[PDB]
Design a protein around this ligand. Structure first.
Ligand code: HEM
Ligand code: HEM
Ligand code: HEM
Ligand code: HEM
Lengths: 146, 140, 140, 146
């Protein structure tokens, strides 16, 4: 995926102020709450019965932290997205058999979470830049299905 | 279908839009045109640039339909019958595009109502916009 | 909703299945498992060998359930209420996989109904299986 | 998009027998009937108001023939579908602005047509080989969006 120099500059500027410890778990939590079929894949994580349980779950938060780590890698290597996600693609595709549709859902949940935290700063031009990233990450993570 | 909890959630959240309906409606269209440029082709007769009065005007109609739908939540097929006819037959809007506008309405609401946009309300709002979108593509 | 023509076409083409319903279910399940291997993970302990009795037996139940849904075509949400809770609450079936099975049931009918699978009937069966799919994914 | 030596033979054997002058039109026809919103791109084509009109339309059949040409040209270049279809990618993506999801739907409708015309001969082993081809054509047509 091709970001313009201004887009790339705006994306990085926003990502710098993301709380690497909470945002990942907020995205992963909302996925499990909003698209409950995704819970099929985290039965090991314990109580996911209610929204507040899912968002309170220490394992959802700790896993979220790893999920954001992988987006940070992606941002750092936008010209090598397929490679960055090669190991995670064979994990999610060959071993877990997650439908690549859910990759795109998590991405859009991530965008909602960034919008919810940054308010006026998350402008439409900034959103458009981020919708190219998460689409790129989704396509990259789905390589083992292609 | 939408639950008592979900209706309560949508009425509470959408209630706080108030006089900003047109502003929110217009921001959501702009987000959709910039992020998903394929949507621009459905509005060829509009200036789609930032600050556009056709977009602000259309934003208001879109948001007003949503307020109307919130108020007819238990009776949406009949409330949006005319709108379903325009979107399905006349305009022939790709059902994919409703997902794209729906995502941008959640993003807009997320950016403007921080305290309201909890996980539970996010889930309710998403369900509601899916329900709106189903009815608007029902005449397919 | 489904036009009174759509129901007539669904009741016409599915009525011709009749005795072979059990065998078409099995073929549509085989087709989905081969075309879309992600679906196999919902059946981890199944004997998925070609013409396995277990798949024949499951193709039987799916086929019977669709037969029921043709008979309650005006009353599907309540006909398939226990089947909704199963697919949604217990099994957590990804909505996408319903479009995959639905498509593999279309390939199976076209391959078994040369004269009977006209564009019109195709469109009606497609709309029908989309309706069943909406009900089965409804309890999220 | 990796077809095994037997998958490529099953795909080739079947394709050889396809009536090159009708199957295209049948696929595009059923797309317009089953997915009406698709007629939006084919208003230049005249009457599309009923199934019979759609299948009878000389422009539908004339166009269906060009679509099936592009599928034939993909089946001879399975190892590089990005390059075979990068001309047509630009057209549908930058010019015509077709949402890439519709490439998937045409793919599956073509699979339904091949199923209608060959009957028992279109076994799952053969369908499964074609699902890889249509998914591959769709992914390559959509590449000027990635
Ligand atoms: C861009 C989207 C996504 C990213 C970046 C991502 C990233 C990751 C990462 C970094 C791991 C940990 C790797 C390891 O420890 O070896 C992981 C594990 C996992 N992911 Fe994802 N993921 C994504 C989407 C999804 C989705 C949509 C699902 C399910 C609906 C999913 C299910 C899982 C599961 C089940 C695990 C293993 C968890 C465990 O057993 O402990 N992922 N993912
Ligand atoms: C929740 C979703 C939506 C709502 C509530 C909505 C609502 C409306 C309303 C109220 C109108 C004007 C009715 C009138 O003036 O008679 C309208 C017109 C229109 N809508 Fe939508 N709409 C939605 C989604 C979409 C999407 C996704 C597209 C395209 C991607 C779209 C394209 C249009 C177009 C082209 C018009 C015609 C406006 C004009 O004539 O200039 N709509 N919509
Ligand atoms: C038209 C679509 C479908 C129909 C009519 C249907 C119907 C049924 C029926 C009748 C049963 C038996 C349940 C019982 O005995 O109470 C069942 C079970 C099941 N279905 Fe479906 N189903 C559909 C789609 C799907 C899809 C797409 C998947 C997965 C990709 C799926 C996965 C299952 C599983 C895992 C079971 C339980 C089997 C077991 O005992 O291990 N279904 N379905
Ligand atoms: C596998 C999927 C598809 C293939 C292989 C395909 C292939 C082609 C080919 C070969 C042409 C002729 C280009 C030329 O003569 O210069 C064409 C034109 C076109 N395609 Fe597609 N196409 C596909 C899907 C779609 C879909 C899904 C739509 C719309 C929903 C679409 C809309 C068009 C339009 C509007 C034209 C121009 C028609 C005209 O000249 O009036 N295509 N496509």
């Amino acid at each position: 995926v091709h970001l313009t120099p201004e887009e790339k500059s705006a994306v990085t500027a926003l990502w710098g102020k993301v709380n690497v410890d909470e945002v990942g778990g907020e995205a992963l939590g909302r996925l499990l709450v909003v698209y409950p079929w995704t819970q099929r894949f985290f039965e090991s994580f314990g109580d996911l019965s209610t929204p507040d349980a899912v968002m309170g779950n220490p394992k959802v938060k700790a896993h979220g932290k790893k999920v954001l780590g992988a987006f940070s890698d992606g941002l750092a290597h936008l010209d090598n997205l397929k490679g960055t996600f090669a190991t995670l693609s064979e994990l999610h595709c060959d071993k877990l058999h997650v439908d690549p549709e859910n990759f795109r859902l998590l991405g859009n949940v991530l965008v909602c979470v960034l919008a919810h935290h940054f308010g006026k700063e998350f402008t439409p031009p900034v959103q458009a830049a981020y919708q190219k990233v998460v689409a790129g990450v989704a396509n990259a993570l789905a390589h083992k299905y292609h | 279908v939408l639950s008592p909890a979900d209706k309560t959630n949508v009425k509470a959240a959408w209630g706080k839009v108030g006089a900003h309906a047109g502003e929110y409606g217009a921001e959501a269209l702009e987000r959709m045109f910039l992020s998903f440029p394929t949507t621009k082709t459905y509005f060829p007769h509009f200036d789609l640039s930032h600050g556009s009065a056709q977009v602000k005007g259309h934003g208001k109609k879109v948001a007003d339909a949503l307020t109307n739908a919130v108020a007819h939540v238990d009776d949406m097929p009949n409330a949006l019958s005319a709108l379903s006819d325009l979107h399905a037959h006349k305009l022939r809007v790709d059902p994919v595009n409703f997902k794209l506008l729906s995502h941008c309405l959640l993003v807009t609401l997320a950016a403007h109502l921080p305290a309201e946009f909890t996980p539970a309300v996010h889930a309710s709002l998403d369900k509601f916009l899916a329900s709106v979108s189903t009815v608007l593509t029902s005449k397919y």
